[PDB]
Subunit: 82 residues, 2 copies
């Protein structure tokens, strides 16, 4: 083993932070989609809401994977240190 | 304050937000892959394989997400164009 617990924790932080940024991104984009509601036809809005929900579903897979990686790294760092 | 009315400029602004988001997402997955790569050889191969496998799962989700954002951007731009060409 060449890696230090501190380095594993740094990379774990990168994964946690990426997961947070991804959630923030989709939140901002959701605001944009929300802003269009009622400003054009319901059928048009429904199409964009549908597409946007597909993007949310992808992110609902992505985020827990990143958090899992982050936590797995921290678990190993703890094991190495102690 | 009033609700902001849709115009081609508004649709293009939002289309740009989606396109920018796709690029930021690409940058993120590239950075994280670099992190996973940086661990190669720093510990047992079996451990590296586990993290590579999990990372590949995240990359696959990301490879669905990015084109969906790009599709939204394209669709918004298409409507912006239609608005511009039917008004002027």
């Amino acid at each position: 083993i060449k890696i230090t617990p501190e380095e594993l924790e740094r990379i774990a932080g990168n994964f946690k932070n990426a997961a947070g940024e991804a959630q923030s991104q989709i939140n901002r984009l959701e605001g944009d989609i929300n802003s269009l509601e009622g400003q054009w036809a319901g059928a048009t809005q429904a199409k964009f809401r549908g597409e946007f929900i597909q993007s949310k579903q992808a992110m609902q897979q992505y985020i827990p994977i990143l958090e899992g990686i982050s936590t797995d790294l921290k678990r190993i760092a703890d094991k190495f240190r102690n």
